[PDB]
């Protein structure tokens, strides 16, 4: 009964996790179709009536079906994320907490900074009996117990780590035998670890991608009430297409510099507005009729808004949009004002933005070239140059694809983790112990088989 309910639940989980990306692209396609239909959307007439106007007349059922389908696909994308990406996030968080417990004593020697929401939230998962649920090392509690138990206190270490040592001693000693029936519904309900699920839900809610998917679903739901809320889903193209990643990276590489440049532009324009407000107020009459003058610089706020809005957007500066200075006692001063505004604001600052974007492009290209050059000229593991191996024909490539392949090193870690500790050989046990103590001396650095046996091999 339960063995089949859980099996079919797992089947659905696996299907959604497998098709997370396909449903992720389907949501973009449906969003594009909806926004293409929305281009044929008309205002009809004192309440204004937004009406879908088309000759065929079938695009309204198409729009409603597409909206419902988009909402369903958004929900399914959330489910697929929870089935596929959430386990990786939980594994990473559980690994980090375990490492900070063992090699840093993050809750024994020193306490979190009270400014780290992650550190404060991770306090809950320690006491749970379902800890390393995703992380492979199930002995982290025992490791911390051995490391800090004799010095900081066996009982308080056990209380912090949620270990029942007295119950363990009784279980190891003589004990009565008790059966366990999983069929009981009360047992099924009480088996789950509430506190660990609380911590996991907190981590998932604090996850950025899950929040973005929730925002996607919320906008999809709001699209039913107002069909123009479906336009926010076109912002998903940046994440959908990694080709737009590299174009947008030019903007985002120096985003802080761009923001600071805009702030500096506002400060410079404010200084110019101060000067105009103190000396050139007479020239800011914007009303052509002589009856009522529309003075744009009688107030400091109005003059600043006028400058920032009109003069910056103007091709020639504020002088293109303010009165003519001919035949005035401040003609030369105002000419200097306009020319300096044009040069500093229109020319130089926009040039700074230009240069920031172009330099971001160049820097990204240089970084890619550097990565390629390093990987082509030196081995990733040992770090020895390509020429030494290339003394033998194809020696560098033979070394980096057979002897020191990082893929082979990853496969060795997988094999050693999935292998039983009792079945480890001498070399495997040595590497396992160093890996458990996080000692990376076994990685060959500056030496290799060919360099050690140089004369014997050749």
């Amino acid at each position: 009964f339960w063995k089949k309910i859980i099996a079919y639940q797992q089947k659905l989980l696996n299907y959604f996790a497998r098709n997370f990306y396909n449903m992720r692209m389907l949501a973009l396609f449906v969003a594009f179709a909806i926004n293409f239909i929305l281009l044929f959307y008309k205002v009809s007439t004192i309440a204004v009536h937004y009406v879908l106007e088309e000759s065929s007349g079938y695009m309204e059922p198409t729009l409603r079906i597409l909206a419902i389908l988009h909402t369903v696909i958004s929900f399914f994308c959330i489910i697929g994320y929870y089935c596929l990406k959430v386990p990786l996030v939980i594994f990473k968080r559980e690994k980090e907490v375990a490492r900070k417990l063992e090699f840093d004593g993050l809750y024994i020697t020193e306490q979190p900074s009270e400014d780290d929401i992650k550190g404060q939230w991770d306090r809950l998962v320690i006491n749970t009996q379902s800890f390393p649920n995703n992380y492979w090392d199930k002995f982290v509690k025992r490791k911390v117990m051995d490391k800090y138990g004799e010095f900081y206190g066996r009982d308080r270490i056990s209380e912090l780590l949620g270990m029942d040592k007295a119950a363990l001693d009784f279980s190891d000693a003589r004990e009565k035998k008790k059966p366990k029936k999983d069929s009981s519904l009360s047992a099924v309900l009480n088996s789950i670890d509430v506190k660990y699920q609380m911590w996991k839900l907190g981590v998932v809610f604090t996850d950025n991608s899950f929040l973005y998917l929730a925002w996607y679903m919320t906008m999809s739901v709001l699209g039913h009430y107002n069909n123009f809320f479906f336009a926010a889903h076109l912002l998903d193209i940046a994440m959908g297409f990694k080709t737009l990643r590299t174009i947008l990276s030019s903007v985002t590489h120096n985003g802080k510099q761009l923001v600071l440049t805009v702030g500096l532009l506002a400060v410079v324009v404010y200084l110019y507005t101060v000067v105009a407000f103190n000396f050139f107020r007479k020239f800011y009459n914007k009303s052509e009729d002589g009856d009522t003058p529309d003075m744009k610089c009688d107030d400091m706020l109005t003059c600043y808004m006028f400058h920032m809005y009109v003069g910056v957007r103007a091709g020639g500066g504020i002088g293109d949009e303010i009165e003519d200075p001919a035949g005035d006692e401040y003609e030369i001063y105002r000419i200097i004002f306009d020319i300096t505004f044009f040069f500093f604001v229109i020319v130089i600052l926009l040039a700074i933005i230009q240069g920031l974007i172009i330099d971001a492009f160049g820097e990204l290209r240089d970084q890619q070239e550097q990565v390629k050059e390093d990987m082509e000229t030196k081995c990733f593991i040992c770090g020895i140059g390509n020429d030494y191996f290339d003394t033998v024909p194809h020696g560098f490539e033979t070394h980096t694809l057979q002897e020191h392949n990082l893929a082979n090193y990853l496969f060795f870690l997988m094999y050693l983790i999935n292998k039983d500790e009792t079945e480890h050989t001498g070399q495997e046990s040595y590497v396992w112990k160093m890996y458990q103590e996080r000692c990376w001396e076994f990685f060959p650095a500056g030496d290799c088989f060919r360099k050690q046996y140089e004369d014997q091999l050749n």
Binding site: I5, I78, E114, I117, Q120, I192, F205, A214
Partner: protein, 184 residues
């Protein structure tokens, strides 16, 4: 200093290594205060010199503004520098840095609430989502699953994640309200 000199000038002595393990604690204590440089001695040979680094000197050197001065000096000497005057510019920088660190030593005299609100919102909103299991309200679900329907299975599966999403919405709303109350 004696033991460090002996160990570094006889690197392959087992007895000296045993003495080093016997003296590990003292060497560990004096490691921050032990200085080590190399010079070309009077005998036309590279000699290694051991001296004392003071705690005040270390702190004033690790002051951030001194680090900025170091970075600026390194940038200058690398870019607009010639190897003739590299050691002269380095000595000038060292002299200026020593003077300013002595000056700093002699002048020396002998978010939390937002994070707490967010954590409270997490705790409360998660407790609301878990009260349905806590209350033992599973009798209703058991009554629906008296008889199996694949439709019932799909409905419950979708409803669980829908409830999770609603709880996340409540959490976001609580965070927004708390942030507004804080900024007020």
């Amino acid at each position: 200093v004696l033991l460090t000199n002996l160990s570094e000038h006889m690197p392959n002595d087992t007895r000296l290594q045993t003495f080093l393990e016997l003296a590990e604690s003292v060497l560990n204590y004096f490691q921050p205060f032990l200085g080590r440089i190399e010079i070309m001695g009077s005998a036309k040979r590279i000699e290694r010199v051991y001296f004392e680094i003071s705690e005040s000197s270390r702190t004033q050197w690790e002051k951030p503004q001194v680090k900025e001065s170091k970075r600026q000096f390194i940038f200058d000497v690398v870019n607009e520098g010639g190897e003739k005057e590299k050691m002269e510019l380095f000595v000038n920088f060292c002299e200026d840095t020593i003077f300013e660190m002595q000056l700093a030593a002699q002048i020396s005299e002998s978010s939390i609430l937002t994070v707490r609100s967010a954590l409270f919102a997490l705790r409360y909103n998660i407790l609301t989502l878990m009260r349905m299991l806590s209350l033992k309200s599973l009798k209703k679900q058991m009554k629906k699953v008296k008889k199996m329907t694949v439709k019932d299975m799909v409905t419950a599966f979708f409803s669980s994640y829908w409830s999770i999403f609603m709880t996340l919405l409540h959490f976001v709303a609580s965070v927004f309200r708390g942030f507004f109350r804080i900024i007020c």
